[PDB]
Amino acid sequence: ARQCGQADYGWLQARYTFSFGHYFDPKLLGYASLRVLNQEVLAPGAAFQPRTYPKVDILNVILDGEAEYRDSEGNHVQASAGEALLLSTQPGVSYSEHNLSKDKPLTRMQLWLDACPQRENPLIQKLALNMGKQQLIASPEGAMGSLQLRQQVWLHHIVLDKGESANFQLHGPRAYLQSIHGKFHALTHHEEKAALTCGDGAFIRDEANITLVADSPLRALLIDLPV
Ligand SMILES: [Cl-]
Numbered sequence: 175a176r177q178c179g180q181a182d183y184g185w186l187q188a189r190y191t192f193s194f195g196h197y198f199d200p201k202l203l204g205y206a207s208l209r210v211l212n213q214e215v216l217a218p219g220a221a222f223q224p225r226t227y228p229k230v231d232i233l234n235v236i237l238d239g240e241a242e243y244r245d246s247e248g249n250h251v252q253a254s255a256g257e258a259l260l261l262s263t264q265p266g267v268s269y270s271e272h273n274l275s276k277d278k279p280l281t282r283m284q285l286w287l288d289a290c291p292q293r294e295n296p297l298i299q300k301l302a303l304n305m306g307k308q309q310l311i312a313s314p315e316g317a318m319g320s321l322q323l324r325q326q327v328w329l330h331h332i333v334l335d336k337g338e339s340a341n342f343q344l345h346g347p348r349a350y351l352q353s354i355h356g357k358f359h360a361l362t363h364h365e366e367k368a369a370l371t372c373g374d375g376a377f378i379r380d381e382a383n384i385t386l387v388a389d390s391p392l393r394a395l396l397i398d399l400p401v
């Protein structure tokens with residue numbers, strides 16, 4: 175009962191969870207998949223109960239409000255709207271997420287990627303979203319000032335006006351597109367491949383180049399996936 179498309183007015187109130195499987199390919203061994211993509215809203219004062227995670231790293235993109243993230247080992251970080259946070263989680267450690275406001279709610283999008291826990295990676299990283307047409311916000315080596323992932327994944331944040339476009343060269347054989355707000359379509363080889371309404375996702379296979387075109391004011395993600 176989210177209305178779309180031009181204003182997509184209540185996007186910050188939307189709550190949903192995608193849960194996806196783990197891909198295998200005999201020619202691409204041991205690589206990670208996108209396992210969850212969710213958007214959640216926490217009420218003023220509210221706070222999820224601590225939880226362990228199943229061999230995944232967690233990337234949060236704060237859309238509205240502010241939150242604090244704590245773990246059972248004493249590590250802590252706060253994130254406000256406009257920031258992305260990566261938690262490279264550790265076996266048997268519990269993690270909590272609290273809304274810092276007693277007055278105002280919190281909205282955030284969260285991705286889980288499979289992780290090889292023995293791979294080195296900083297426990298906590300944050301990145302300030304620049305909000306330009308496209309930004310690389312996470313990558314294997316933290317190229318171009320991006321969050322460093324211990325997966326072979328490149329994550330892009332897209333902000334376009336209606337009718338604007340952005341082109342992407344893909345490293346892996348799989349891409350996932352996500353509408354954060356607004357509608358858009360993807361082209362490959364100058365031909366339409368998929369059209370996404372507000373809040374849609376779409377996996378796209380074996381395209382080395384993808385062009386995204388906004389059909390209303392848009393915020394989106396494009397995830398370049400290794401298998
Ligand atoms: Cl990987």
Ligand SMILES: [Cl-]
Binds near residue numbers: 378379
């Ligand atoms: Cl496809």
